[PDB]
Amino acid sequence: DDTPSSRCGSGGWGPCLPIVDLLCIVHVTVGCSGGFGCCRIG
């Protein structure tokens, strides 16, 4: 739903995870490679 100004490995999102294993929808895909996103880890 239009996530905030976050980024992979900038706050709570990990370094980089392959969408192939993704499980969320509102995750974040900024700062990562084309095809890899990140979800709320901690």
Residue spans of the domains in the chain: they are 1-42
- Going by their DSSP bridges, the two strands 17-18 and 36-37 should be labelled as antiparallel
Strand partners of residue 18? 36
Question: What is the SS3 string spanning 20-38?
Answer: HHCCCCCCECCCCCCCEEE
Q: At 13, list the tokens.
A: 């999102």
Distance in angstroms (rounded) separating the CA atoms of residues 42 and 33: 21
Q: At 8, list the tokens.
A: 């992979």
Q: What is the CATH number of domain 1-42?
A: 2.20.20.60
- What distance lies between CA 25 and its chain's CA centroid? 10
5 DSSP assignment: S
Strand partners of residue 40? 13
Q: Please name the method used to determine this structure.
A: NMR
SS3 label, residue 18: strand
